[PDB]
Design goal:
The structure is a homodimer. Chain A is of the alpha/beta class. Chain A has a single domain, classed as Aldolase class I (TIM Barrel, Alpha-Beta Barrel), CATH 3.20.20.70. Chain A contains 9 helices and 8 strands. In chain A, strand 5, helix 6 and strand 6 form a beta-alpha-beta unit. In chain A, helix 1 runs parallel beside helix 3 and helix 4 packs parallel to helix 5. Chain A is globular and about 40 Å long. At the A-B interface, helix 2, helix 4, helix 5 and helix 6 of A face helix 2, helix 4, helix 5 and helix 6 of B. The PDB classes it as lyase. Keywords: orotidine 5'-monophosphate decarboxylase, mutant V201A, lyase. The assembly is dimeric. Crystal structure of the mutant V201A of orotidine 5'-monophosphate decarboxylase from Methanobacterium thermoautotrophicum.
Chain lengths: ~210, ~210
């Protein structure tokens, strides 16, 4: 789809290491394979938001800020603005806090020419308590708000088909499979590999 | 209660300004009245996590990191560790992601001698869609995790009574009322006031 992002090789690196030296070393080594890197709070709180601009300038990669934004609208707006000002191309936001909290993010994204990804579901054990039961309604809420980018369940293929049914064939879907998701996310498989470059190469082959 | 934190004058400052100069100026001016400051991502993402230690070293205040932690357990652990390493006394974490995600935070807080606050509910309009219906069960989940500190609804006093019922009379409850909550949180009423010091003084007088 022309109107959603192109992720090189359909493979996103989840750069979840917390020290800047290690994080930079891995990302540069895989830049030939991956052009899209997802960073979260462990790295940015440890090293500073300046690390976002550093990844973009050193590797020319797209950055998705996996900040799971989950506050009231006014605070969500400020979080998004700070994150986009730091150079993030996109931000991941929770749907559980409701439509006006998501819309606040959409507003800033439109102002600044950036992207919002709605997190529809999570796959860790405790996700059963509240998140799983809300997932379809959260996805529908996204569709109704014109959300174009979604983060889906890590496990359960049949969950991806259901999400794809709700969001349509045009929207962009990433999952931590490629029959339904546009790109997959790899973390440890790569950054804990002795040869991250080789690891990335291998995943790409099977893709 | 001896085992939960003492908040000076039962009044917490929500320091939601995003520039370090303005934030420091307001907090220092009210340190006589307030010893507990709540900081969120707008400030720390804009100015750096080092600002937490700066607040503590300049004002000797307790810092609560309102980070609404809402990730998987392993990531929650790392967020809490980074935040406590930066000097936060406490961190606010969402309950919606479930019990293991909360326990991960409790584990690090136990290791490091810090505190976890469970956010049981929110009061902004969209909170009706999913949060309001989960609030009592989230509170019960907290109690069944030995959670001692809770952040409750900003609005609706009768919600505070329900929460207090679930969590018991011993647990620590803060709210943005004092018949149920141990402390209240003031933000704009103070940091946007002509003189914050006077604003704080005023609210305090209303508190007996």
């Amino acid at each position: 789809r022309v109107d959603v992002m192109d992720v090189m090789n359909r493979l996103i690196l989840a750069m979840d290491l917390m020290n800047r030296d290690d994080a930079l070393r891995v990302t540069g080594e895989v830049r030939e394979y991956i052009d899209t890197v997802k960073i979260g709070y462990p790295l940015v709180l440890s090293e500073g938001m300046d690390i976002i601009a550093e990844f973009r300038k050193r590797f020319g990669c797209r950055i998705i800020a996996d900040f799971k934004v989950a506050d009231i609208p006014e605070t969500n707006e400020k979080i998004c603005r700070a994150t986009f000002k730091a150079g993030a191309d996109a931000i991941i936001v929770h749907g559980f806090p409701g439509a006006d909290s998501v819309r606040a993010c959409l507003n800033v994204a439109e102002e600044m020419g950036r992207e919002v990804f709605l997190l529809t579901e999570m796959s860790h054990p405790g996700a059963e308590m509240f998140i799983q039961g809300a997932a379809d309604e959260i996805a529908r809420m996204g569709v109704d708000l014109g959300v174009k980018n979604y983060v889906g369940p890590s496990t359960r293929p049949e969950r991806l088909s259901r999400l794809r049914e709700i969001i349509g064939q045009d929207s962009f879907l990433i999952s931590p499979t490629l029959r339904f998701a546009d790109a997959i996310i790899a973390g440890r498989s790569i950054y804990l590999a002795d040869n991250p470059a080789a690891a990335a190469a291998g995943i790409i082959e099977s893709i």
